Symmetry: C3
Subunit: 496 residues, 3 copies
């Protein structure tokens, strides 16, 4: 069929097509325009990104510990479909850990040899690297995700509105969200979702290509990368055509089991005691200097370090929100607002910090021992780092194959989930859309990832996600205030 | 028409005249007695000032988030006279600030080239300078002001007692505060208020004289400074006797609008992106190291740096507390204790930190760029610093004239407001007395400022502030506990 | 053997056999024990310092949470129960039950040791002094009193609201219910008795070491280990004699006199020392301790790996954990009719603040003397750690009188420690609350003295550290389980109430 939203489907399709045509028809003009635009946006609005993420996290904490914390999503009589532990495990499944696998070793090592701030000795460099990795992957990312998921769940369960970003502004837009005011927000949400998913797909493909090159010595041309992307998208859409939700839903739990086994293997075969001590000490130091690193803007040095690491991560989380928050809201019916915020903030953040310690802190322990091949490997390219890390463990080939397969399956699950989210947002059917729409959205994500990889690689992904996450940072602030207003309305309506 | 409180008015006049006579008749003896006394008080009770300001701020925060936060000033009838958005702007003490114009640039530059604690890099020196400027002008000053305004509002609105400092001890001293026990507290409050006002007037005159000298090289003599003070006080006297609003209360938000326009111009013509990033980062670092710098006492180095900056600022806020808290309480009827404390704490402190960033952080950016003329200017005399800062902007002369006019208007507003507060303290009932007493109190403030400026300048103002703020720090702690008891008994009374 | 036995088997039997077995191992295998105890202590510290840090942090966070949760309104001993003493007197009594022996041993020695042997690298001596004061505050501040507050709160709630016996097996009633009558509550009771006995033996050994060092410093005597054993026997004598001749109030009055004498000693050192420096340092050091609370509480020395925590931080956490039953018993005994929030706040803030004030008055004064240029105390602490206070007292008027007063204070603290710990261990072992014959608690005091003698002969302070660490390793797990058991019990009481 053609179950679409005419103002959203059309606008998103021609915007994506126009960007693709600009990228391909202008091979060299875009290669200089994109870095300039990304640099301008980062330099002029890093303070705004920092303020946005801090305000969103503070708002989530305040909502958890206020009179709104007793509000139960889906109604007062609504009952959770899962237990607390299973819900926590499921919450540490919407994180889409392709970036986790890409950065777990690369980011701490890069911060070690390219320090955010000047340090005296290597010990302080390692501590700072762990602190900034914790900042980038800790409370702020999951706070943004918790806020967006809470808004979506409250407006799709308590208010019965469709779980689309246009409805999230109902409290002070009234019925005005039906044309060129909720349409623009819907278009921006679809674009930000598509570009965050394309960034993740490109990261996964880059890491898979690097792993194949490192293991089997192959020469993976960009045409081979495009063929890989097309093959994976096709094999993911085959499940959508025939056999929906299987074996894709079970893949989401198989991925978590495999990732837990991988992390446990690295924890046991690595410096286990060092990993535990470093986990405790690094979490304590991250919480101790939380306000210092969260509000840091590199004002006086002006090194431009945040333009690639911190501002990029904030923009990535903000642009990824309409997807991670959507899947967080889908599985969270019957939870109270306080319990929801706590269970999205603490446990997923703690597990992310544990993974970051087990991998990056072990890498830094290896580096501090005098083994600096990993620093050179990261400097040469950021993609191979994990595999170089696995060179320091038994069963290096088996571990690398397992990691590549894990990245492959994460890519499949993220592609399917993002196609579902983008189709639901754009069409507005919320489940009544045909299969071909989801297949086309998967194709669009794959094509955008291919085009970005050809026209810059990782830099193109960073540029796209930052550019599409700035206006969505504004939208997220407005959405946070709208969610507060809606929670006030619900509290006033109840407690008669 | 002599409506006065005898053993407040007479006693305060006697002490003021006695100090004036001691200062004039003993030119050189006072010039060595006052610095020694100030050094002794600062060295021996800097820890006490630190403890007092920390306890007052913690008490204000606790009262905001306790069961007393639901208590509404003026009873449950509510009906505040102003909206919250306008109340936040109206909450800037009695004015946007003379001291803020004096120390917007001079203090950060001084902390840059005279660091409170040892630092290794100029970047760290600038960060520390901004952190200590934020400490001195941030949450502690407005916490003291919020506590005093809350006490005055609660005891003048919920209990209908006169808005004098002796009533604030009614829950503790019972009815006993009506002779030689509330009289002493009233005398100390009047003296501390008068000396804080005199310090502000002296700072304003010093900065105006420095600006005139910098702009035109007029070589303003101390006699000309006294003439300027007399002319300003005469202008304030002309404002009164004619129904006011000529005058005073008309330079608001006219003063507020002029100050906001000045800050906007400096923010735009200066480094805008640097100012925004520095504001965010400096506020975050000031909150991150709040307990480290608030409780810091310079114990191990013993450099004596706090004697001129930190302890002086705490004593200044403590002594200024009656004056600021009077109007903080006056225009805050019908607001809950929690809302009042939050609105006096966050927004005024945040905008003060924004002003400090826009001016001092821009100056520090200029210094870190390589231009170190402001360091030399501040070392020669802090008074010219702002004007030297304005040398790095377009329309330097116009901006300097605007700043001088702003200081002049703040002078008039603060003088009239302080005269009103001191008249209320020494007379009572808030209706009396005839305006001649207010004129006399304005004359007294001007004369005290003149005498202190002749007998030491800024150092004399700091000495008077510290000496009159130590016993008032003790009084402020006692007042905080008495206000807590009064709030508890009001909550218990409302069954 | 007859009616003169109110022991609870097999806690009596198992505890006595374990103590006797360790005593025989120590006295029959000198080289074996001398090579095994340091190795076992090093292994435990290295492998579970992170766990000790996590345990103390979780216990303190749980205490703060219980203070400010819905359980803060629960009144121990019933909703109608009234406090036995006033708030100020109760606060004064709460700054006790640590016996002060550790605080007199480490008042000067710990800050000086952290000054010349820094936990972390520092550039200037000012930073070294600040770090020494910060880590001293960490070791003697909120974490120790948080452990004590949690244990005392559990004991008070389960011995007053639930009327269960004030042993550690009852604290797990909400989790196992009725399984605590054999080999499950028995093992927990045995471990609690052993940890209490070894913590009290550590305190007694510290007191004896300090007294011997003070006598050597003052009168130049050569106190042989035989003389140390004689001193311990004489104390576990005269104290047993006091116990025999109905002197239950004679130890309470002794404790009150000890508190007054310690307050006078602290005031004298505060006045005759750098008073202004002490006040400024107290304010600044408390502020710095609170400012870097999470930094130093969670610090594990992961990257340097210097092993510094194995002797200072992990030892202190293990000591507090294995020493918390004895402290919490008397913290709970005097806390009837007080709300959970009020109890936690009054055990956390005021005793911690007074301990930090004492540590400032002594250690910060010593650090001021060192920074002035007098480094005799550094050399004295390096030579031996037990003379430091007396060397410190060499910088004050009436040095001999102050040293004699300190020695007498340590001796009286030793008597109070012996009596109180004997009572606690007798109550735990025999089960009945103060119903066993006096000979049982006399034998427990004798056992404490013998264990202290054996540990002092077989290593000295290192042996005491090893014993307390080994016995506090499983008790950290026990305390972690007991925290959640107490939370479940508080939830059960809240649900049972509001009827």
């Amino acid at each position: 069929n053609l179950v679409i939203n005419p103002p959203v489907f059309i606008t998103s399709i021609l915007l994506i097509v126009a960007l693709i045509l600009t990228c391909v028809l202008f091979p060299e003009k875009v290669g200089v325009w994109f870095p300039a635009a990304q640099l301008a946006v980062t330099s002029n609005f890093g303070w705004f990104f920092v303020v946005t993420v801090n305000v969103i996290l503070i708002f989530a904490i305040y909502l958890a510990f206020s009179k709104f914390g007793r509000i139960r999503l889906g109604g007062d009589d609504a009952e959770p479909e899962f237990t607390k532990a299973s819900w926590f495990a499921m919450l540490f499944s919407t994180g889409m850990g392709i970036g986790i696998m890409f950065f777990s070793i690369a980011e701490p090592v890069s911060h070690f040899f390219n320090t955010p701030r000047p340090v005296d000795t290597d010990i302080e460099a390692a501590v700072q690297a762990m602190q900034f990795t914790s900042l980038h992957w800790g409370l702020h990312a999951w706070g943004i995700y918790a806020m967006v998921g809470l808004a979506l769940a409250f407006f799709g369960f308590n208010r019965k509105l469709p779980m689309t970003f246009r409805s999230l502004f109902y409290p002070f837009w009234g019925e005005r969200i039906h044309g060129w005011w909720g349409h623009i927000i819907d278009i921006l949400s679809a674009l930000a979702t598509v570009f965050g998913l394309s960034t993740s797909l490109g990261l996964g493909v880059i890491q898979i290509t690097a792993g194949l090159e490192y293991l089997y010595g192959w020469e993976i041309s960009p045409m081979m990368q495009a063929g890989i992307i097309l093959f994976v998208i096709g094999i993911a859409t085959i499940s959508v055509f025939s056999g929906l939700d299987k074996g894709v839903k079970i893949l989401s739990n198989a991925n978590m089991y495999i990732a837990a086994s991988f992390m446990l293997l690295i924890f046991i075969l690595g410096p286990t005691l060092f990993i535990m001590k470093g986990y405790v000490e690094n979490t304590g130091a991250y919480l101790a200097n939380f306000i210092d690193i969260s509000t840091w803007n590199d004002t006086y040095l002006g090194s431009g370090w945040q333009n690639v690491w911190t501002i990029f991560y904030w923009a990535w989380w903000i642009a990824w929100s309409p997807f991670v928050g959507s899947f967080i809201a889908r599985i969270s019916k019957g939870r109270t607002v306080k319990e929801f915020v706590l269970g999205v903030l603490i446990v997923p953040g703690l597990i992310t910090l544990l993974w970051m310690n087990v991998f990056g802190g072990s890498a830094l322990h290896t580096i501090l021992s005098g083994d600096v091949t990993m620093i050179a490997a990261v400097k040469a390219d950021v993609s191979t780092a994990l595999f170089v890390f696995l060179e320091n463990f038994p069963f290096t080939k088996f571990l690398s194959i397992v990691a590549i397969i894990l990245i492959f399956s994460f890519f499949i699950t993220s592609s399917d989930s993002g196609s579902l989210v983008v189709d639901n947002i754009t069409s507005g059917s919320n489940g009544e859309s045909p299969v071909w729409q989801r297949v086309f959205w998967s194709f669009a994500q794959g094509i955008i990832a291919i085009v970005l990889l050809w026209g810059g690689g990782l830099d193109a992904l960073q540029t796209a996600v930052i550019i599409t996450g700035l206006p969505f940072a504004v939208i997220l602030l407005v959405m946070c205030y709208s969610l507060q207003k809606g929670l006030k309305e619900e509290l006033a309506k109840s407690s008669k």
